[PDB]
PDB file of C-alpha atoms in Angstrom:
ATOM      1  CA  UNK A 694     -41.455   1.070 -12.518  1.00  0.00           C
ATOM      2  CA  UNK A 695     -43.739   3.700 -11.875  1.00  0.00           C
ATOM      3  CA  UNK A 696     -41.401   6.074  -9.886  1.00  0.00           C
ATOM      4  CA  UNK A 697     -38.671   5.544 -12.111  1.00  0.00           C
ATOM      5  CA  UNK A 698     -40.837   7.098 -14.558  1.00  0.00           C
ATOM      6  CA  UNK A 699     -41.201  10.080 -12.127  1.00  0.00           C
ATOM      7  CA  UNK A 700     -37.678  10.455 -11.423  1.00  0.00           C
ATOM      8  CA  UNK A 701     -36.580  10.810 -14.919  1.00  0.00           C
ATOM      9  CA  UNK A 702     -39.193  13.791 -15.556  1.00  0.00           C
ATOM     10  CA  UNK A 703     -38.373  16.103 -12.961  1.00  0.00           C
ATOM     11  CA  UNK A 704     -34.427  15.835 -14.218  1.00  0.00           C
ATOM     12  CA  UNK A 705     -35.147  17.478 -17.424  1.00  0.00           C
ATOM     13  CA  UNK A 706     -37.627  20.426 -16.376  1.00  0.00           C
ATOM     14  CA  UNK A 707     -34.202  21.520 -14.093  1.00  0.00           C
ATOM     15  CA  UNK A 708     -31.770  23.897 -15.711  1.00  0.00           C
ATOM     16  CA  UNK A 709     -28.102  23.268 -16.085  1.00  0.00           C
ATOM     17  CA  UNK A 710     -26.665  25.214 -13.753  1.00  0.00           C
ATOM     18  CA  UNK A 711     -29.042  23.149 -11.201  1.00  0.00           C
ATOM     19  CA  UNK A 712     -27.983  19.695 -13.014  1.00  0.00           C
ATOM     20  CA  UNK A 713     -24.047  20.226 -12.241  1.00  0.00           C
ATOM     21  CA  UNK A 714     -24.694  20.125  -8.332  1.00  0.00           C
ATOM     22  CA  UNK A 715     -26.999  17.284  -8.244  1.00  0.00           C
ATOM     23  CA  UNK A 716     -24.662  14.938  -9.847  1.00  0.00           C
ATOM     24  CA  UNK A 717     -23.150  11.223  -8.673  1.00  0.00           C
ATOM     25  CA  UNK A 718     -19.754  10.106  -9.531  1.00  0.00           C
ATOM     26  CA  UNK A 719     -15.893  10.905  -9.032  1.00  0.00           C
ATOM     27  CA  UNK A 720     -13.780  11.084 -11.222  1.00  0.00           C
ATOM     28  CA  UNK A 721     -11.318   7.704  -9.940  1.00  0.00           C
ATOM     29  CA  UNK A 722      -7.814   6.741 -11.911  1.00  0.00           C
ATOM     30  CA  UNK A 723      -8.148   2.951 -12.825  1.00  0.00           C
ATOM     31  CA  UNK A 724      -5.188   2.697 -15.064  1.00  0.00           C
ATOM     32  CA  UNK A 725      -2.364   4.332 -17.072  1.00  0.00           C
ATOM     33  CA  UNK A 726      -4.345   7.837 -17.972  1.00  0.00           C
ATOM     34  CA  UNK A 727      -7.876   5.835 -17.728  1.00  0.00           C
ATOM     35  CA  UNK A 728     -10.047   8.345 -15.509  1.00  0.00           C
ATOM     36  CA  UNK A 729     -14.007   7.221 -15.759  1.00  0.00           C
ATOM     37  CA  UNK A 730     -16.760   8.499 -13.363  1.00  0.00           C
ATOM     38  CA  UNK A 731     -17.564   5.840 -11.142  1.00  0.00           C
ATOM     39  CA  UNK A 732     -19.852   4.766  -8.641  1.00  0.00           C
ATOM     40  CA  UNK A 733     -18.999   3.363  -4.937  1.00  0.00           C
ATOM     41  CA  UNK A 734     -20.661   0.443  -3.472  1.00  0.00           C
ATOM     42  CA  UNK A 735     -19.392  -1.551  -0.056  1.00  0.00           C
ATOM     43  CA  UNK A 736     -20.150  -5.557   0.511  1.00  0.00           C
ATOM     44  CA  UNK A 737     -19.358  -7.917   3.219  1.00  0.00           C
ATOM     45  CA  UNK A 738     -19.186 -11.319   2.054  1.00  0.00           C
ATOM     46  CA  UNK A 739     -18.607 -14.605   4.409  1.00  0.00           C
ATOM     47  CA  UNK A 740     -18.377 -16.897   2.306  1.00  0.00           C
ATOM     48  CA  UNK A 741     -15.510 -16.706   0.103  1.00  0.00           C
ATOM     49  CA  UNK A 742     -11.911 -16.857   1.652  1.00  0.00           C
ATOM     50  CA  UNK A 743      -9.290 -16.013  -0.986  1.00  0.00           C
ATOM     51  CA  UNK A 744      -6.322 -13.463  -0.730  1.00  0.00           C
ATOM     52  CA  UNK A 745      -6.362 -10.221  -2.848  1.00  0.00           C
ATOM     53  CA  UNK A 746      -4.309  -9.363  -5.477  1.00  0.00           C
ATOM     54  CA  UNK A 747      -6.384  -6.553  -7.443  1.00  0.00           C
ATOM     55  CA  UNK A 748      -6.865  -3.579  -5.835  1.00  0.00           C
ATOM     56  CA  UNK A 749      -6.269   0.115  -6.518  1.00  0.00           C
ATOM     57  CA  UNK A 750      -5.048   1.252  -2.749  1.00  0.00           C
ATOM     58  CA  UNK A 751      -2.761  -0.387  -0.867  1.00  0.00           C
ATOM     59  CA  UNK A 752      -4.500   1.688   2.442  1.00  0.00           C
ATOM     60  CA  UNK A 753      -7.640   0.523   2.837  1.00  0.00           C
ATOM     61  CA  UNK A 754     -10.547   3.018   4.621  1.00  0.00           C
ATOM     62  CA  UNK A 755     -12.337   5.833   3.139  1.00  0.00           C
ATOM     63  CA  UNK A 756     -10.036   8.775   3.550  1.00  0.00           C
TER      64      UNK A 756
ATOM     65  CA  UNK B 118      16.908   8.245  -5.005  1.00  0.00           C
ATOM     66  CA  UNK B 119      18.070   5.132  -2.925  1.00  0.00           C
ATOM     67  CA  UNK B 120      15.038   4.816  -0.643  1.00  0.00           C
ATOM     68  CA  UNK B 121      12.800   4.849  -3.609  1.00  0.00           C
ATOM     69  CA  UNK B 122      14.278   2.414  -6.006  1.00  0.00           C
ATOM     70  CA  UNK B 123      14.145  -0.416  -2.650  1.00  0.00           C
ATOM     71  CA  UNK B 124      10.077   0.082  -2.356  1.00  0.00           C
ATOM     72  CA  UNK B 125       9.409   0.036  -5.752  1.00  0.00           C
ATOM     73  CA  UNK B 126      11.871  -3.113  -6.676  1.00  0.00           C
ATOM     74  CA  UNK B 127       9.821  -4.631  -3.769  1.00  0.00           C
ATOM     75  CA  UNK B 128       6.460  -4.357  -4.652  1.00  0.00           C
ATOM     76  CA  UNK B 129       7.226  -6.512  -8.311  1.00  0.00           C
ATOM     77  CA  UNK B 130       9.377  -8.576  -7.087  1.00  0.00           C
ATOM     78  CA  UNK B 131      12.886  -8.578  -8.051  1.00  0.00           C
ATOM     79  CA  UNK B 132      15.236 -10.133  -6.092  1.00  0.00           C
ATOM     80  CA  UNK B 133      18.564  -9.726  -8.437  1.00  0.00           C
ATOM     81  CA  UNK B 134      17.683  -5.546  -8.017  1.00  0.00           C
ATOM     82  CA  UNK B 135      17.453  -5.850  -3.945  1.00  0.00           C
ATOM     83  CA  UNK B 136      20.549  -7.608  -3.323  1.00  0.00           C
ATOM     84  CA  UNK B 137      22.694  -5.159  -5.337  1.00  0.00           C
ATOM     85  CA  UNK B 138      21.117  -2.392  -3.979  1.00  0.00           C
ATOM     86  CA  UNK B 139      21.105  -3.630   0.136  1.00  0.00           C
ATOM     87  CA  UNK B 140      24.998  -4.197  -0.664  1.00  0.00           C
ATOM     88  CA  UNK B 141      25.134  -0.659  -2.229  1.00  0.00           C
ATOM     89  CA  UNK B 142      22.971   0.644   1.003  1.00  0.00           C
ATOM     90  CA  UNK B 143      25.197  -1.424   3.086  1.00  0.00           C
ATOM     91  CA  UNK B 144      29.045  -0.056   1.739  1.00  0.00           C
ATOM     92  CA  UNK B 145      26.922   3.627   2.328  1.00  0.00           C
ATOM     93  CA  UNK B 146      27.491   3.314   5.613  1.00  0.00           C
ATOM     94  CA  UNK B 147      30.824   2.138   6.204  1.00  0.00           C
ATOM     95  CA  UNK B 148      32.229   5.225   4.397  1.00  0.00           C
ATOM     96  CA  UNK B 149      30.166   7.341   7.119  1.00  0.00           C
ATOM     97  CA  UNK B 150      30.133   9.245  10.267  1.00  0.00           C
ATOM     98  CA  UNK B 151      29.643   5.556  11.909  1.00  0.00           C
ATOM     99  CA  UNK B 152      28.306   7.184  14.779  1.00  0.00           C
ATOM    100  CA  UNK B 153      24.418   6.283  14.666  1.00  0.00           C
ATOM    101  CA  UNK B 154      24.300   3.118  12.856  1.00  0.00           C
ATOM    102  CA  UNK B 155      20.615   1.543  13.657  1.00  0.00           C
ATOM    103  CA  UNK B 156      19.214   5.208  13.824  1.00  0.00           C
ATOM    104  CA  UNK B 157      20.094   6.481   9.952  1.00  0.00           C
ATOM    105  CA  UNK B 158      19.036   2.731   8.543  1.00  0.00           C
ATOM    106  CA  UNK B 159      15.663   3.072   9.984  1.00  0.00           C
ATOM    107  CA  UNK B 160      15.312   6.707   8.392  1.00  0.00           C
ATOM    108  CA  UNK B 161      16.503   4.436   5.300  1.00  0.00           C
ATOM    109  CA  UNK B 162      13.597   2.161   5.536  1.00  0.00           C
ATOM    110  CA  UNK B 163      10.682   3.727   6.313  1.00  0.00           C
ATOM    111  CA  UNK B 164       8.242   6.262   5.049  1.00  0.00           C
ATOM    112  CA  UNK B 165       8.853   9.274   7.366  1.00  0.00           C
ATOM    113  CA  UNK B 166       4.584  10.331   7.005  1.00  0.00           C
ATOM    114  CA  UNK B 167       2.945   7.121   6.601  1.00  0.00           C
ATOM    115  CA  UNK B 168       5.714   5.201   9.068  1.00  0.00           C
ATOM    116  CA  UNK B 169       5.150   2.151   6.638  1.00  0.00           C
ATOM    117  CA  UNK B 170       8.603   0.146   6.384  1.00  0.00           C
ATOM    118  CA  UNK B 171       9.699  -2.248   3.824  1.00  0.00           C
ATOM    119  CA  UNK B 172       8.520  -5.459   5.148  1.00  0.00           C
ATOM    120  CA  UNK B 173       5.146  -4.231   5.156  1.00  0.00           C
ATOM    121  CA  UNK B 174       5.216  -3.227   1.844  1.00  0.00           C
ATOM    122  CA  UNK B 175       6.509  -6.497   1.005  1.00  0.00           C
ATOM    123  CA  UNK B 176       3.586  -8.123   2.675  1.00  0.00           C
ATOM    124  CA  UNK B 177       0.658  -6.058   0.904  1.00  0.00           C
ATOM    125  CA  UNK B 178       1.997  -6.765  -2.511  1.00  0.00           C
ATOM    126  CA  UNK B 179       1.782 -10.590  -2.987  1.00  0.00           C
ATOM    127  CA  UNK B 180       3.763 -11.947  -5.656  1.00  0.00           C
ATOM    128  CA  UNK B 181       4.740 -15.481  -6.482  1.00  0.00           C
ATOM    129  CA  UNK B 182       8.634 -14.663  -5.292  1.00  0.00           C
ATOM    130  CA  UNK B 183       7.700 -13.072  -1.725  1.00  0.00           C
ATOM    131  CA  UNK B 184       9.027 -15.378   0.982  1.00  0.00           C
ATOM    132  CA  UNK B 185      12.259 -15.310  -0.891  1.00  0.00           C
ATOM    133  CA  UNK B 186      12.363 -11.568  -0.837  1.00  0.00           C
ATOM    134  CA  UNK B 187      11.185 -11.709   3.108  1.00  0.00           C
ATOM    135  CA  UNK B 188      14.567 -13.916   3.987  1.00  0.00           C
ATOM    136  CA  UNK B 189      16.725 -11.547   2.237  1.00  0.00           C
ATOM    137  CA  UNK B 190      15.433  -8.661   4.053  1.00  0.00           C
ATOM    138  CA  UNK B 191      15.718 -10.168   7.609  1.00  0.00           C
ATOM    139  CA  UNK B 192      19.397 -11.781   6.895  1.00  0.00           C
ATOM    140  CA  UNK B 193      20.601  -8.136   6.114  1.00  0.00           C
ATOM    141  CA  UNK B 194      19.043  -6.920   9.502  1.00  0.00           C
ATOM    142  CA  UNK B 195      21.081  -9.523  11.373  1.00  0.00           C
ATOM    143  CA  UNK B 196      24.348  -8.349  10.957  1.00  0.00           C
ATOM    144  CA  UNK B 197      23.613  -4.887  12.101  1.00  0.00           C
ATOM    145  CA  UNK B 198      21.812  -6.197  15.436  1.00  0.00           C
ATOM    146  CA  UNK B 199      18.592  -4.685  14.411  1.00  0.00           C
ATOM    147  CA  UNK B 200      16.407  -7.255  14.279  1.00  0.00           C
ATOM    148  CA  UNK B 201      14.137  -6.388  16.729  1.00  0.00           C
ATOM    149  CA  UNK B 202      13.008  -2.905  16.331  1.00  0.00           C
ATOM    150  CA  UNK B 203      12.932  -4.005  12.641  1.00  0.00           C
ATOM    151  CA  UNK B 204      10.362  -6.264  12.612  1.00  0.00           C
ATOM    152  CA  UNK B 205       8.317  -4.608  15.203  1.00  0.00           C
ATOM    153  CA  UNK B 206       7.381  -1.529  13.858  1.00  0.00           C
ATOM    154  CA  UNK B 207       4.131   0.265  13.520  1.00  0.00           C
ATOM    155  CA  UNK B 208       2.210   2.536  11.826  1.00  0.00           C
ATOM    156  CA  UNK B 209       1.912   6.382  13.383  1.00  0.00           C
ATOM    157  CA  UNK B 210      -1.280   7.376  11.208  1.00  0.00           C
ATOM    158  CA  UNK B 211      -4.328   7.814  13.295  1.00  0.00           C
ATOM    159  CA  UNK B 212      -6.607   5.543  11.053  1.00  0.00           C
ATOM    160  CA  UNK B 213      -4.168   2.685  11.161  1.00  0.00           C
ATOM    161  CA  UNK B 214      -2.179   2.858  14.561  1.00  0.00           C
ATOM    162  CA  UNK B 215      -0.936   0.139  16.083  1.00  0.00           C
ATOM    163  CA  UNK B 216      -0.550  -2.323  12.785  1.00  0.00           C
ATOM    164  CA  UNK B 217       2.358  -4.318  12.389  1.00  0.00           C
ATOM    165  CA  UNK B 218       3.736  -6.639  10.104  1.00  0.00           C
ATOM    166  CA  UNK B 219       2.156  -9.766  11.761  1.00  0.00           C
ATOM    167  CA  UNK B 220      -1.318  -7.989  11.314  1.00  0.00           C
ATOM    168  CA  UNK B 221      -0.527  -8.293   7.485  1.00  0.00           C
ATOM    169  CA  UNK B 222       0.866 -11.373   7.016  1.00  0.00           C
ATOM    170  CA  UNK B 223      -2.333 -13.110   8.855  1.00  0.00           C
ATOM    171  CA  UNK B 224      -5.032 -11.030   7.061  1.00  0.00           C
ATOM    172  CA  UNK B 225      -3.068 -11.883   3.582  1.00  0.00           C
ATOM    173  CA  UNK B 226      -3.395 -15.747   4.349  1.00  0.00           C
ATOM    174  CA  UNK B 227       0.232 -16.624   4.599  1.00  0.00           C
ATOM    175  CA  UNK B 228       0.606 -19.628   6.648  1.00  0.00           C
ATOM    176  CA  UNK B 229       4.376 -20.046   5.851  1.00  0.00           C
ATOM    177  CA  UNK B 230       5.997 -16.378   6.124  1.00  0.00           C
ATOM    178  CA  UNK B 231       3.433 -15.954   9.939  1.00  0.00           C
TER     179      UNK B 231
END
């Protein structure tokens, strides 16, 4: 809680020219003209055995 | 504008739009050179990039009619003696080489159509 604090100080004194490179998300296409700006995070999970219907590639793998 | 209307009738599956068609894609080549008769129906079938066919795109796309849409597309490759090279096709991309059909249907959980 204390570096969070930190973090969030040294994004404002930055100018915005600098802010436009250091930036997360892509822009992704999750439905019929939907595009958000979204974050990627991978799992492996044991545990749970079902088949997948919902899923936005067909081809798995990063590309 | 025949190749695409088969993969996307495929993926939601509608099986009174894939026999009309596969009798449509059938009478196509009967009024034809009927020279190279396996060789132009695998062009038909498959992506030429990707080399995906369309019993793997079946097989990805789980619906609640698939195993009736599998037996219609393996009774039209037995009366054109194409069974084999049919069902044992593979990918040619360099990040999925070597999968088959019978890679999908096992890592989908289908019991019945492995």
């Amino acid at each position: 809680l204390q570096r969070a604090r930190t973090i969030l100080e040294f994004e404002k004194m930055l100018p915005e020219w600098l802010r436009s490179r250091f930036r997360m998300g892509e822009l992704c296409k999750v439905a019929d003209e939907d595009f958000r700006l979204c974050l990627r995070i991978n799992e492996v999970k044991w545990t749970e055995w079902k088949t997948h219907v919902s899923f936005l590639n067909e081809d798995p793998g990063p590309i | 504008r025949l190749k695409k209307r088969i993969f996307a009738a495929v993926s939601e599956g509608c099986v009174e739009e894939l026999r009309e068609l596969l009798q449509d894609l059938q009478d196509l080549c009967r009024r034809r050179r009927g020279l190279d008769v396996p060789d132009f129906l695998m062009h038909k079938l498959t992506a030429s990039d990707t080399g995906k066919t369309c019993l793997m795109k079946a097989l990805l796309n789980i619906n609640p009619n698939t195993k009736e849409i599998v037996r219609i597309l393996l009774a039209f490759a037995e009366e054109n003696d194409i069974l084999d090279r049919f069902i044992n096709a593979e990918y040619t991309e360099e990040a999925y080489e070597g999968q088959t059909a019978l890679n999908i249907a096992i890592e989908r959980r289908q019991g019945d159509i492995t």
